[PDB]
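Forwarding the complex inputs:
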Amino acid sequence: RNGNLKVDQNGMLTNASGHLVLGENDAPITLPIPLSKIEIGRDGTISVLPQGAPAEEFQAVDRIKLVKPNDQSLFKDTNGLFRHKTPNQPYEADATVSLQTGAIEGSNVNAVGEMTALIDLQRQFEMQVKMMSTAEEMDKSSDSLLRM
Amino acid sequence: YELDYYSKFGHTDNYGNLDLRNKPYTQLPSGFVVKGNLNISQTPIKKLPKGLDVGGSLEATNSALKTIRSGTKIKGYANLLGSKIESWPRGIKLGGYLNLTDTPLKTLPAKLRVKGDLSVIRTPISALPEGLVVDGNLYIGGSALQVFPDTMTVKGNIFLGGNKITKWPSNLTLGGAVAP
Amino acid sequence: MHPALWVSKTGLDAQQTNIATISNNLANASTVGYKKSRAVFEDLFYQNINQPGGQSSQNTELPSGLMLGAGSKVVATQKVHTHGNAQTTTNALDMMVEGDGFFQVTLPDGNIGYTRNGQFTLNGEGTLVTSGSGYPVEPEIVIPEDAISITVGTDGEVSVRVRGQQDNQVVGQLTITDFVNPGGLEPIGQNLYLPTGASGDPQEGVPGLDGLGEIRQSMLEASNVNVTEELVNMIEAQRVYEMNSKVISSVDKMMSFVNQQL
Amino acid sequence: MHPALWVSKTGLDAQQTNIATISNNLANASTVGYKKSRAVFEDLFYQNINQPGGQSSQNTELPSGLMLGAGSKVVATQKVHTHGNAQTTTNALDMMVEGDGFFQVTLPDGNIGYTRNGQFTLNGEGTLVTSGSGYPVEPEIVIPEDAISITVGTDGEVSVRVRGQQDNQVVGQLTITDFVNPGGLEPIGQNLYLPTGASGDPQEGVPGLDGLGEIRQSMLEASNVNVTEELVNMIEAQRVYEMNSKVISSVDKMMSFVNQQL
Amino acid sequence: MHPALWVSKTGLDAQQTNIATISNNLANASTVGYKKSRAVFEDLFYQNINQGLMLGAGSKVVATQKVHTHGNAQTTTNALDMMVEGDGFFQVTLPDGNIGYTRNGQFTLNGEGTLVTSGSGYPVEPEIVIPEDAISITVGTDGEVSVRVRGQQDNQVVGQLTITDFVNPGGLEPIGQNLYLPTGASGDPQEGVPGLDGLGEIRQSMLEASNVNVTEELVNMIEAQRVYEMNSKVISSVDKMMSFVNQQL
Amino acid sequence: MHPALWVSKTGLDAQQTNIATISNNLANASTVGYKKSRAVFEDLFYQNINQPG
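Prediction (whole assembly, six chains):
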């Protein structure tokens, strides 16, 4: 979900995490090296302008592969990429996903939700700690049984 | 399964020692490079990827290791006591000993050089290759060997381990002795 | 350390880099031809704790398949190479590029550095040099002493007016460089950029053909920083910084309770 | 968490949703044909903690019939479709609907989208399109290349003036759509709406008959947001946000006292 | 973080672009043949949460619409500056060789007498060359350029100007210097005699003044400033709310 | 610091030059063989955020 796209010196379209962006052909999107104006469409279409070309020669070269699968069937892997729980499952390219160009999507962490969860975890952890000391206290009393 | 870029990151310490003890991995990435020691003992790995480079020692005891591809480089030793390997490839860069005790090993490449001891204890190997040079001791106890190669160099003491030797090398420079 | 302590610390270091790159932008809020930078964050790797086998798809929704992150980091300080506004000055020696293009100056070590800053002047010999450290502009442009005015055309063709003869005599032609990935250029200070592998090979050509920009005389390129954007991102960076401080103290209090109670 | 902690947290989430709603209204304080949204709050269900059978109309004023709430929630973000003021412009291709009615445009998927924003232009072939994404307006209106003027009547009658011939040539006519429940329309951005089940079936017709609004040329409909309302709502929302924070802090201190003293 | 922080930031960015266009309109309040522009606002996508609950993402300026309304006329005594009475752009030849289309009419002569622009000196297509023997320059209402020659009855014709009209003038690409470039949405260059088939007529010794409404721009600055300050207060309020929470929670 | 600040600065300088041209004409209102002057305005470059068409 990181749309901080960039174009390397070879022309391949990647993001800030250094991941190759796929296209319609299911291959990394490679754009012509000497381009002059790159615009990403609402539907994911990539339109470029060659170096020194007139403004009426805009052409579409690729379309970003946008996928909308069931969220409950995805899991976060070790590298932050969401993948299918069932392996060897192809990712169908949905035609309903739309991209709003010129903006970056941040996180969705509810900080207050984390804070109230934090204070509850501390209290539950410090009542279990008291239980551990209570069990230790009860054992020392039983040691007096065998003192004779 | 297989080993990925991040799968191996969970089995590496500060000195790059890869520990795969009893891990359910079946293979390693092609052209694998390990800075330190590699431990694949008791693993279902059947074949090592080509171009493997180990900066430390190899340990695959009681594992399913059966095939090794040529060009593998090991700075330390290769401990394969109890593996399933059947044949040793030629061109392995090994800087330590080759422990093949309790292995189904049958054949060895010609002109093999071992910089330390060689143990083929309890192995069905039939004949040591001609030109075999060992810079340490020789262990052949419980093996099927009964005939030695014409020329071999064992810098250490050859230990027979019980098997009867009917033919001795014609050109043998031994720094130690021969024990039954 | 308790792993929860260092996870929160990476968030603190990530914001510290964010604060550093956000104070630099506001410091260069009046620098001519300055490109703003933004800190890009990305989460660190997740490790399987209850299943060392390394299969994160078996029972990921179960305690055995639990994965815990290692924090956050700033992966890059990305330069935003958007064109800036135009400053109309009276000096005839400062120039501007309309659109894509980079000026070329020769560094003391020999290689050339590329700049958007167009604040130029003349040295004692008369060559066109930078208004700061004084690095000459490639190609060399020497102004004759008898010249009374400098005219830089839209294609960089430098001509001077000399009395006793009509028509302006041409004494040089500027040439600008464009890059496939200008964001990969290495900033070295003094309004200079050095080419890198990620930027690509320099593409040199006349300023006005093959998609290159045009040289504008008596005009300067303002810094593209958005002072309001920096202030808004400054507000977020503080609050995220404070929140990671709260959890660190929360872990400290819990651990202090353990060895005080037990 | 503790029951008291989550009750206050729901109030914090509800106020967070409320502020983001009134933040949206202030951001869209200038967009043409914008309808403000207000967050509607509702109280969550009540639990009979002391009753093992869930019967309430026996002893509601006794400890047996005690019922405890679960907090609050935002049940909906209601769009207020109040008619906005008029902006008299000189561009003759932007238009306004006086009264109930929506313009209809053709989305790229083929489905028809509805808008109140009347900022329209022409495309390369003369078809009347929106001034933003460029979607065509249904029914298609093509302006001839030789037209010197464009006149849009109150009923959508698009006529043009052509030299060499008196009397205006009518090139088409616009139609507008009305909904039984305009508040049920799905906002999809771009000042565009999509029909839904809760909205009602589209009712196309002539703009000026059968109760539909009239098309006003060279005019625009300003957003109906009240900047004063949003500032007063911010004051109430911010204060309530702080009140629930003190409750959460109070519970934390209360539970901290229990395990510190006991 | 807090959604209200960045939703309000969109309003700050949207109004900043809006103010930039207003200042551009006021700056070009004396430019001949300048067309004023207004910023077109549109709301961002609405997200569906808690699942019928829609939350907006802010606002943005999606386009800068140029209003090609014909400006007033300035009567000048210069014989080389002209005007288009209606729809039509003068076509000039850029150094790249492509044709740029302009509505500014301040023209002059080069050293060789070719009619060029009074600024950068770009020639006007088709080339009109005024002979040295000419004593006056007359440009007809249909682009007919003629000069008065001493010793010869009747003005001799030295060329005929043509103008180009676009179906969508707002789709042209401004590149400065009162110049436009054809685009995909502009349409096709419709060239013909200046005065037939919807084309405007050439008016000599007249200039087309800017069409900006300086009164409107000042009122537009009033609402842009207040909405900009209105959105900043939400960010300030959200900042003090988040400061309160982590100080309290 | 702000795009509107830089845009309006160019407007001020343009009118500052424009006034100096008008003041010269009125100063030379009686000079023999003096030809009047008029300042020529033009708009600066346009930043291309979204390409029309």
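The first strand of chain C starts at residue 37 and ends at 43.
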